[PDB]
Amino acid sequence: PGTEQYLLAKQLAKPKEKIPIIVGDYGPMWVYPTSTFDCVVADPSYIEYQLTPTNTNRSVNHRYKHFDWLYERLLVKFGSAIPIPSLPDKQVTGEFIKMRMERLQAWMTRMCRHPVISESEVFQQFLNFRDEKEWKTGKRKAERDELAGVMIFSTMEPEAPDLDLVEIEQKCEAVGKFTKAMDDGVKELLTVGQEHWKRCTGPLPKEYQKIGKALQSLATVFSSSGYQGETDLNDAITEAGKTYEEIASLVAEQPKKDLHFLMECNHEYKGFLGCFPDIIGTHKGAIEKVKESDKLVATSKITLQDKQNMVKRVSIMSYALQAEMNHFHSNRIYDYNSVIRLYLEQQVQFYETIAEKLRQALSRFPVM
Amino acid sequence: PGTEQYLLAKQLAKPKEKIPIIVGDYGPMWVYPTSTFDCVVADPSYIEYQLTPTNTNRSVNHRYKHFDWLYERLLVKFGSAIPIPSLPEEFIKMRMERLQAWMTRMCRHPVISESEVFQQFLNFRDEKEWKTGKRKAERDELAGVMIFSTMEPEAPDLDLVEIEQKCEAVGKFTKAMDDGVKELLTVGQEHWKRCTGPLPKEYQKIGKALQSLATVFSSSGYQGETDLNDAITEAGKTYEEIASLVAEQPKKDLHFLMECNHEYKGFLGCFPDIIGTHKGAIEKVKESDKLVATSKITLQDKQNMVKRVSIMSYALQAEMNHFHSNRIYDYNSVIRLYLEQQVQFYETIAEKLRQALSRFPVM
Structure with a gap:
């Protein structure tokens, strides 16, 4: 019965370590x-x-x-x-x-x-x-520090007009909607990424390692003919064989240069997301009780005052929920923009590196 | 059998269709x-x-x-x-x-x-x-081991010594190459299955994933994402395209390398019997000494076998000269081709990524 603790406390208690909340260019936010x-x-x-x-x-x-x-x-x-x-x-x-x-x-x-x-x-x-x-x-x-749980909201103080149950309720469901959906969106990139990771460090390199060794094997045999004009081709064929081995290796060590980070960012957010469930739960639960305020006033189980405090306090909760989301989205944008850029650059450099490794091997071959 | 039939044939009659063999600067060869x-x-x-x-x-x-x-x-x-x-089709x-x-x-x-x-x-x-x-x-009863009867090498008869070692060599090379081609054919088919099966699906799965995320990112109601979420959805599609590239790539290169190695597998599958034929010939020409002392064949009969098995060798070396020269040209050509297409492949991916990267603002 903690939610009822904050919503119905005496509150003659004024916070010391007051946590401010304001309304920036868009929506309530923390005071950074x-x-x-x-x-x-x-x-x-x-x-x-x-x-x-x-x-x-x-x-x-x-x-x-x-x-x-x-x-x-x-x-x-x-x-x-x-x-x-x-x-x-x-x-x-x-x-x-x-x-x-x-x-x-x-x-x-x-x-x-x-x-x-x-x-x-x-x-x-x-x-x-x-x-x-x-x-x-x-x-x-x-x-x-008994200032925890749902009680934390009391130490908070937003400098803006008090909200109403309507809008407040929207934001809650809104937030729960976005987060749930993301957790799925993130949970998937993770799944796929982990599979691709297994392939790039697993069988994929072996395939290149294979081809690279096969080529060289052929070259060596080719060299056992005593025919005039082997040196040129055989060598080219060999170095090519080695090139693929180099490529295999380059492939195996590639995930840690890029995929890794994309993967980390997602794990980190998967974590943040894994928290909103209980947060929204608390908000929803709080909203419900406030709804029951009227019926509690008529039955005389609480005074009109108690109701005001309930609204004022649940309204505060909304502000904190949004102030935090603004922090959440703000970072999301910056983080995903960075890791994906990073992942992309690295990729480009990766494939470009392979391309050149081939061009070189290529230019080693004769013309006949 | 037919070996003895040739080595000890009656003869005294030159064939109509004549196949010449001459020894140029690089050994015996057919007349091109x-x-x-x-x-x-x-x-x-x-x-x-x-x-x-x-x-x-x-x-x-x-x-x-x-x-x-x-x-x-x-x-x-x-x-x-x-x-x-x-x-x-x-x-x-x-x-x-x-x-x-x-x-x-x-x-x-x-x-x-x-x-x-x-x-x-x-x-x-x-x-x-x-x-x-x-x-x-x-x-055309002028077939099998008899074919050699129609060949006329313009050179000094060889000796049972060189003929033998020359033959062995051919078996050792062909056999090794055969084992070498089979290895290449195996890994190539595997890597082919990969590029046309899973690998493509992975990029496909990643592409979608990105798009799904971008989509969700849009339902935030937040502000500014217009630039970001757009670059994400684009990059996701990029990968989805890359997936297609990967899948349709083998036909452009790997395909040919395989065809080349397949054709030679056939070429190399024919030597077992060819060498077997020659090897068997060399033995019959060996027991000649015994066949003479035992009044089985005349001194002349023996000379015929030797001189005739000399022709076989020349032939072998002539075809080998044909074989090797083309092997060299064929492999060098196809591999260059494989490498060329490979480079274009990776530069194409690099490029498509570079485009997706641009759509992403810095910070």
């Missing part, structure tokens, strides 16, 4: 700072990743366990208002970090970028703690 | 004519084919079956001396294609092309002439 700071992670007694925020140049170390602590806290606090991606995972008991730390740096960056997650006490303390006590004390301030 | 011709096979009441020998404009029409008859006859007559390549076109090449090989062979059977097959004015030539060829 003007000092965006990222944070490096690397330099691997257990595994202790070193976080180096490019903002104070004061390092801090954390073991994976700590990250889960951070994610969990973030999830519990802003989880019902903002999509909190999922941390990677420890493959086996030991390549590993290469695909792990990689996804960890990303996770950190995303968090860092978010105009709200970053300015959060809990995120700060995680990055800015001086000693064992300072850390332990902070690592307990959060765990006890 | 001054003006080599060719033949045309096209223009399709059962199915037939019109053969127009560029030599002297005057076509004749034959039904595939007639060709089969020709293959047989050729094989029976020059088979133990010369490799006879094998015979074969898609069907009638390939068969017509394969028949053209087949016909050309024959026409460009110094011995075959000038043979009575081959000639008459090309120029018969009516059923009478035809059925006649057909009966004469079928009864």
